[PDB]
Amino acid sequence: LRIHNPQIPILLDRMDNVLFLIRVPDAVQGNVLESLTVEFGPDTDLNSIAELRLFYSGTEAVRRQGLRFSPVEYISAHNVWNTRSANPSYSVMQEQASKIGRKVVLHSRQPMVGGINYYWVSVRMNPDASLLTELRARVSEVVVNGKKIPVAEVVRRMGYGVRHAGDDHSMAYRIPGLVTTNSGSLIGTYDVRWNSSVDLQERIDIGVSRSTDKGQTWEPMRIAMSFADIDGLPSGQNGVGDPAVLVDEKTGTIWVMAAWTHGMGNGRAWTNSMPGMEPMETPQLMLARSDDDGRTWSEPINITKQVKDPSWCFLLQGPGRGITMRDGTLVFAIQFIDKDRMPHAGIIFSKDHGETWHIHNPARSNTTEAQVAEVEPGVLMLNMRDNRGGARAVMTTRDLGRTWTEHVSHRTTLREPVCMASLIAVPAEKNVLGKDLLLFSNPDTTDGRRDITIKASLDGGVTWPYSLLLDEGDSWGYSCLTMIDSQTVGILYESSVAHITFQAAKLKAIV
């Protein structure tokens, strides 16, 4: 008998969350799993827990290869009819408890099938529980047919599903970006993929979720940018996506940069984009600004003619977030497909608070999505998705992209499955550790998007000896980081439990 505690976020806004997965390998037909006791750690706040229920799932398919802790996904992150509770057709509730003591006993009575039997324990939190709650629990005993068969450290963390599949009648949400305003508000940005999860071209708008209480609650979604019916073309041929967001820091202005595709049938923009300058010729590089803390958004500003070389097939921002430099320069990461269809990553910047923008030179060939951070005063570090595979490319520039210098961590220190990644810099004076800090988040693998992990470095990205695993499950993998306050990191990412998941974690739990 085995018990697995999955390292996945426990969502405050869910009615079910997988706490324990239980596989009974070779049961005797008719034997009853009579009781099961879960024991919470001494420091666990029991007032934060609303409910605990035991579920009996069925048996297993005979040809399913390997040790498995479930026959199917119990709680869907894609079923637009229910992403918040367990699918009743996969799990049969055996008992549920609302009086949560230090120990909670759950009973079943189910006769049980010969061979593999699946059980699991769900936990529902109070919707107002602290997002910094750490939940330590274990199955202290299991009783099967009168016997206390043996059972044989996982720290669970909370989250909030800022966007679920089907929310507000949108099939999917993707490409998260996250920043903190000058007033302490959190701005979450993302694709609103209405008809499906497919990339541009399609009906896609830029959505914004705003929180003023460090992520405990999120205000209803706002459409910060849309071109639904610009020239009478279908909104499905007027999509805008892959947003990047930044805060000016001196002005307080919030900027969102996104790529608007016009026409293009129902094909993919990455391969159908062609050179030129006009909207019908090539995708447009668009900006939208908010000067009231993200509540209201301006009409789109088209900066294509400012920075796009006519020979490029495609110019777009690097999705996620941008930065303000110490000297006031606003900087986004950008990527462009050149005339030969070779992609390059770079940076776009403005020295006049967003009124005008400039691009110098590409950092590296055959790279796409990137994020930029100021490791040292006047030194920008570009961390790039590299098509060669296996590892992030890392380069630094002191002249805003005129010349680029390889970093020692380049193609070495940060593995990836070729996926978007987030990088931010936190000055010593702005965090509880009192040291210059880099924070990095991506799927910590070389193959497959899973194991979303925050990594920290105390020596400018040469070494990353601190990490925090957030999500075991498979996901679409994109993520974005910000500092909530001096003590806590916030991450908005595509998880195995919600299309757009927010989590907060104490800096001291990582370092």
Chain Cα centroid distance, residue 273: 27
Cα radius of gyration (the chain): 24
In sequence order, which residues have a C-beta less than 8 Å from that of residue 427 and are 6 or more positions away?
436, 437
Sheet order of strands, 115-125 included: 2-4, 18-27, 115-125, 49-56, 92-97
Cα–Cα nearest to 367, from 403, 436, 419: 419
Cα–Cα nearest to 36, from 20, 25, 47, 59: 20
CA separation for the pair 161, 152 (Å, rounded): 33
Active site residue 369: yes
E strands present in 49-102: 49-56, 92-97
Tell me the backbone φ, ψ of residue 430, rounded to 5 degrees.
Answer: -115, 10
Contact present, 5 and 17 (Cβ < 8 Å):
no
**Three-state DSSP state, 400:** coil
H/E segment holding residue 22: strand 18-27
Side-chain-side CA neighbours of residue 37 (13 Å): 12
Q: What is the largest CA-CA distance in the chain?
A: 77
Q: Which of 73, 299, 369, 416 is catalytic?
A: 369
In sequence order, which residues have a C-beta less than 8 Å from that of residue 130 and are 6 or more positions away?
45, 48, 158, 216
Helical H segments across 4-121, by residue range: none
Check residue 100 and give left, alpha or beta (phi > 0: left; psi -120 to 50: alpha): beta
DSSP states of 337-372: E-TTS-EEEEEEEESSTTSS-EE---SEETEEEEEE
Give how far Cα 430 sits from Cα of 92, 263, 321, 433, Å. 49, 45, 19, 9
- Token pair of 466 as six digits: 């601190």
Contact present, 2 and 23 (Cβ < 8 Å):
yes
Quick one: CA dihedral 170, 172, 177, 180, positive or negative? positive
- What residues form DSSP beta bridges with 138? 39
Burial of 459 (0-12, 13-18, 19+ CB in 10 A): exposed
- Token pair of 482 as six digits: 């910000």
H/E segment holding residue 305: helix 304-307
In sequence order, which residues have a C-beta less than 8 Å from that of residue 154 and are 6 or more positions away?
5, 7, 136
Catalytic residue ranges:
369
